[PDB]
Amino acid sequence: DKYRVVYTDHQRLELEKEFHYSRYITIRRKAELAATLGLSERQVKIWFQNRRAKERKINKKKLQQQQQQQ
DNA sequence: TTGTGTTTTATTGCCTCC
DNA sequence: GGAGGCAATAAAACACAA
């Protein structure tokens, strides 16, 4: 049935932290993180892709706001 | 509630690396 | 010799007003 799982607040936290460590995850790290977090490598891949899109989207907006002063 | 918007998983399909 | 990137999209989930 399921169309999307919801990730636990723990799982998200680790992933955000790691994302701050580096925007692109290494093959080795990916494998560590998946194993310690109880998700698949694919899910971690994908999550990292989404987070970079979110970041691009937030950055464009930061820019749009900064164009809007003086 | 219901409608209305934004966020979060997950896929698809195309591109680029020698 | 196939991984890894992005964009565009879908739908569940949330948030919350009216």
Residue numbers in the entry: 187 to 256
Paper text:
To elucidate the mechanism, we performed structural analysis of two homeodomain proteins, the posterior homeodomain protein HOXB13, and the parahox protein CDX2, each bound to two distinct high-affinity sequences. The optimal sequences for HOXB13 are CCAATAAA and CTCGTAAA that differ from each other by the three underlined base pairs, whereas CDX2 binds with high affinity to similar two sequences that begin with a G instead of a C. Two parts of both HOXB13 and CDX2 DBDs interact with DNA: the recognition helix α3, which tightly packs into the major groove, and the N-terminal tail interacting with the minor groove. Instead, thermodynamic analyses of HOXB13, CDX2, BARHL2 and MYF5 revealed that the two optimal states were bound because of their distinct effects on enthalpy and entropy, principally caused by differential stability of the water network at the protein-DNA interface.
The overall protein structure in the four complexes is highly similar, showing only minor differences in the conformation of the N-termini, due to the replacement of basic Arg-217 of HOXB13 with the negatively charged Asp-187 in CDX2. The corresponding contact (Arg-228 to backbone) is also observed in both CDX2 structures. The other contacts in the CDX2-DNA complexes are very similar to those listed for HOXB13-DNAs. Similarly, the two CDX2-DNA structures also displayed very similar overall conformations.
